[PDB]
Amino acid sequence: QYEDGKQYTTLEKPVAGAPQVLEFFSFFCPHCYQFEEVLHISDNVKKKLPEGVKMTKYHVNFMGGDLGKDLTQAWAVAMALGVEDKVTVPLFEGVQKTQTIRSASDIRDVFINAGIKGEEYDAAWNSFVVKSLVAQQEKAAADVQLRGVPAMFVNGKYQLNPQGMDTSNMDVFVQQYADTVKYLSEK
Numbered sequence: 001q002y003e004d005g006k007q008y009t010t011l012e013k014p015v016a017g018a019p020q021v022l023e024f025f026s027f028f029c030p031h032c033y034q035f036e037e038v039l040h041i042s043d044n045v046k047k048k049l050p051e052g053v054k055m056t057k058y059h060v061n062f063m064g065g066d067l068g069k070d071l072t073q074a075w076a077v078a079m080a081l082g083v084e085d086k087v088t089v090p091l092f093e094g095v096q097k098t099q100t101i102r103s104a105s106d107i108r109d110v111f112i113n114a115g116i117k118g119e120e121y122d123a124a125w126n127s128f129v130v131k132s133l134v135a136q137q138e139k140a141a142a143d144v145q146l147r148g149v150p151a152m153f154v155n156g157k158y159q160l161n162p163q164g165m166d167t168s169n170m171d172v173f174v175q176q177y178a179d180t181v182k183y184l185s186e187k
């Protein structure tokens, strides 16, 4: 039922110490927008994972020019402060839906209207911790030879292959995607 090359591929050099379930996304990515707002891929995968398996989500730079680097640093700020749930949707909608986020100051404004004080954002933005988080996201992308998003990796060894699943129907696609992660997570 689950064959290498159909629902998933296998990295030739597995990534030592990778997060068990690792998602890569970009706020510029249209498929990542639907994974968040329509398909809820992340919460559907989470419903089917075994006990205690942690899910990690990293932002990538190669979409959207110099604003893409700023969005990776902003996602680092969100992870450092734990405000992902308050900024994920306003950032997606400001980048892709309204296209009113076009600069670092527009990103900042999203965090402030979500309740993060400007002095707290500026401190985090310039911290060593966020510097380390930016480098961490870029290293994981390089370590899996990432070329596009959305992408999801299981135990640093298996890469989901959504174009090898049924993409004609949204509910079947979500169930095949989440069941593949569950199968691979038990390996």
Ligand SMILES: Cc1cc(Oc2ccc(CC(=O)N3CCN(C)C(=O)C3)cc2)ccc1C#N
Pocket (backbone or CB within 6 Å): 031, 034, 038, 039, 147, 148, 149, 150, 151, 162, 163, 167, 168, 169, 170, 173
């Ligand atoms: C039912 C459905 C099914 C879909 O199926 C996908 C899903 C993800 C991908 C991955 C992808 O888009 N990319 C970007 C290009 N590159 C270089 C990559 O490696 C990966 C593809 C099809 C997408 C949307 C919807 C909807 N509603």
